[PDB]
């Protein structure tokens, strides 16, 4: 007899699926940013 064959998940299921929000952290601190910007002005002024 031919066994039943229909669309089914693979043995052991499927692998994990991500869904949570992921917005990574980037850049420098506020202090560091303002330091770089002020340093640029001073060098330009000089």
């Amino acid at each position: 007899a031919s066994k039943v064959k229909q669309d089914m998940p693979p043995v052991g299921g499927y692998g994990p699926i991500d869904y949570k929000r992921n917005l990574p952290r980037r850049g420098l601190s506020g202090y560091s940013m303002f330091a770089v910007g002020i340093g640029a002005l001073l060098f330009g002024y000089w």
Binding site: R26, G27, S29, G30, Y31, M33, F34, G37
Partner: protein
């Protein structure tokens, strides 16, 4: 279970207040949005080169109608009118009588392709796989009258597309 989408109170220390001031003045979160569109600029686009390339379809696709035959060339349609009864749009008009040899065959089989909703109910209802929706979807016309198919048009579609229609039926009839 539920979660809050927007119930975070910002911290009010120097480190944090100055981080938010930097964002306001230095436009950092706006620059971040520019980064995302720049990244897309360097991605391969998803555009296919139609009509040299075609969007993928499946054997179940519901396209232009066609009337089929048996391998001998005899028509499959025996004018039962199940298709005309089920048609949600009343797009099918059938008349029938005994053929010269006594066979039960249609003398009219019209589909108003501008009434049809391309639902595929007719091919589900047909007891002999006579009427099908084939794979053709490129049959737009310049006049309204060209979309009122009579039996001759539909038999011609069957003879035109049978090679593909038969293979698609072979691929899906075990799901039916």
């Amino acid at each position: 279970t539920y979660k809050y989408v927007n119930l975070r109170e910002p911290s009010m220390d120097m480190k944090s207040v100055t981080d938010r001031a930097a964002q306001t003045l230095l436009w950092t979160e706006l620059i971040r949005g520019l980064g995302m569109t720049l990244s897309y600029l360097f991605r391969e686009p998803a555009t296919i080169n139609y009509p040299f390339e075609k969007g993928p379809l499946s054997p179940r696709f519901r396209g232009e109608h066609a009337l089929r035959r048996y391998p001998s060339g005899e028509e499959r349609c025996i004018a039962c009118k199940l298709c005309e009864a089920v048609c949600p749009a009343q797009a099918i008009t059938i008349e029938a009588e005994p053929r010269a040899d006594g066979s039960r065959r249609t003398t009219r089989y019209d589909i108003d392709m501008t009434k049809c909703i391309y639902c595929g109910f007719c091919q589900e209802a047909c007891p002999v796989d006579a009427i099908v929706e084939g794979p053709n979807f490129e049959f737009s016309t310049e006049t309204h009258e060209e979309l009122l198919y009579n039996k001759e048009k539909l038999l011609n579609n069957g003879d035109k597309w049978e090679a593909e229609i038969a293979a698609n039926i072979q691929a899906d009839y075990l799901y039916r």
